[PDB]
Amino acid sequence: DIVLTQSPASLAVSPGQRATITCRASESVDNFGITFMHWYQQKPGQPPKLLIYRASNLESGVPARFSGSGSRTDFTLTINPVEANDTANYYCQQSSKDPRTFGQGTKLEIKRTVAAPSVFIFPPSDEQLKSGTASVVCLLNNFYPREAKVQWKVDNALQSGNSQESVTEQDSKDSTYSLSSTLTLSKADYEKHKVYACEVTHQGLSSPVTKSFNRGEC
Amino acid sequence: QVQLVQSGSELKKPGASVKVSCKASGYTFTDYNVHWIRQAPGQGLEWIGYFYPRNGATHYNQKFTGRAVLSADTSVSTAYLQISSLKAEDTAVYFCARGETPGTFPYWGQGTLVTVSSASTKGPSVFPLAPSSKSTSGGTAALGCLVKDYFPEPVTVSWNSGALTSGVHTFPAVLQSSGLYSLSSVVTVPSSSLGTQTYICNVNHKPSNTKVDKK
Amino acid sequence: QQWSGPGTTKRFPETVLARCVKYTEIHPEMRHVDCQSVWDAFKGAFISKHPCNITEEDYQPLMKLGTQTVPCNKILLWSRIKDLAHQFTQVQRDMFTLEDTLLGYLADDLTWCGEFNTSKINYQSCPDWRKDCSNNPVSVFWKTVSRRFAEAACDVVHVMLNGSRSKIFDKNSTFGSVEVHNLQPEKVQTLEAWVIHGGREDSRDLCQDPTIKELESIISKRNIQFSCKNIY
């Protein structure tokens, strides 16, 4: 084929500032007056809406923020007024030879000043305790700019090996991350102990806030 | 207006033959091509090969030769793709794509997730993740629905029959230690409306035909 | 019959293989085709036949092996001059013509002949149309591809017609033989035929000149439109 690799691997730009998502071909894709380099913007949960095709043509229906410059070697994609709803992957794609391989992507994210968490805690239900296993969640909000973990405290004895984590993606307007973290003991290890607290930590925090509940006294 | 609509998600066995079908509306079917494009999850994109519906003239990529057999129907205006004798590494998302020429893709279908495994599908179970009994948050109270146990991936919990959209914080279907997927679709709602508006969560899992409800 | 004409040009299968190789190289085609097999179907279309006994069904394996979807509305009909028709499609590469189609890019500015008896190219002599007979395979191919292109034409037509001759619109050309009969007025509405004042004009009262007034006399009895913008 022709193999293409995207030269910025990530970005983190606050809005109102500019970005540059470039790529580098191994040979010339620009032959006989045509260059074939077609960028594609892909939000998650959305197939790619077409961007600058044949290295010049902004498609009708796309905003005029985008300005892409293609060549025989160097393929920049610069966006000068970036907005809050631009949190997407920005693929490149050639079509000069009959192999039509793409790039590999670039995870563009939006830089935002670090908010405080809002911690919640939920005890497991009575249908949960009558159906088998039990599961305590530590729902946060505005909390994960790739920062840190919850920390489980079961009667001041730590319980690892059974604590998952699930991060949501960046929001379109307020850029809000969140995090679930379940702890899946049995019925017996849930009925063995009394305090079931969790200690989060944040860069936006300055103290480790520890929500707690007693066993069956909520 | 010009649009495209393709078939839904499919859980395949190893060795089975996928048959994705699209449907072209808004334009005459004999004018342009019907490409296909892969997405492995978390990865880059990969071209398959394109059909010409004017006289049946196909052209594949060199890797997918023999495995891919494109076809169409000019009367029903539906495009096709078939990859046969599948295996476990080939779990990906495919899209049908129309280009103005070969080498551009403006118009697309919506997406088809195909997953190759041998285990059986498991319908989800719901849990009322109850609100805060120490009710002191102002207007930031929350209750949720602890959903566990998917074997196939995609679900779109409708919460309050679709109406509930603001506050809904659904998590990705993350593989739990047990081996299935699970998330915690919650709702950040006003503390007043938390007690007032009943929050009947209704889930939707399409390969199991499971449509349970919980307040 | 065979004689009194310029024969086949040199490097015929190499120029056929090169030309459309440039077509599958530059244009990403809606089927990437076997440029070699195109020439084998071209060989089976006319080879070792009687020049003045060639009909239109000999060329349809080539025409069904070159099925394009020539964009409608963006079309252009040419007549008379070739150099200014080439300059008008070089300013008008948006509006696709017969010198931009695949089959015109195959057999553009080529002539072919062939002796009836055995498998050889007649490189030296040629059946002329007036002087031998008008059934030669070059005029058979140009009649077939102008029929298909003018039938699939649509919306607005922009014909360039020179006036350097005394006959501005002659009747016996391929334009007034097959193109203006199959202009298909259910999809074409307005016809901005563009008369040229280059060369030597036959008369004054331009656009009231008699042959373009005969084309202004509407052949379609639905009475679809006629117009005549000039080029000074």
Residue numbers in the entry:
A (entry chain A): 1 to 218
B (entry chain B): 1 to 215
C (entry chain C): 25 to 256
What does the article say, verbatim?
CD38 is a type II transmembrane glycoprotein with multiple functions and expressed lower on normal blood cells and higher on hematologic tumor cells. Herein, we described FTL004, a novel humanized IgG1κ anti-CD38 mAb possessing novel properties.
Cryo-electron microscopy structure resolved two epitope centers of FTL004 on CD38: one of which was unique while the other partly overlapped with that of isatuximab. Of note, there seem to be two epitope centers of FTL004, one of them includes from Pro52 to His56 and the other one is 91TQTV94. FTL004 exhibited similar affinities to CD38 (KD of 2.55, 3.84, and 1.2 nM, respectively) in surface plasmon resonance and to CD38-positive cell lines in flow cytometry, compared with daratumumab or isatuximab. Daratumumab or isatuximab bound to RBCs to different extents from healthy donors, while the binding of FTL004 to RBCs was virtually undetectable. Unexpectedly, FTL004 exhibited a slightly higher binding to CD8+ T cells and a much higher binding to NK cells. We found that FTL004 had a superior ability to induce direct apoptosis independent of cross-linking reagents against CD38-positive cell lines and primary MM cells than isatuximab. On the other hand, the Fc domain of FTL004 was engineered (S240D/I333E mutation) to elevate the affinity to human Fcγ receptors, leading to the enhancement of antibody-dependent cellular cytotoxicity (ADCC).
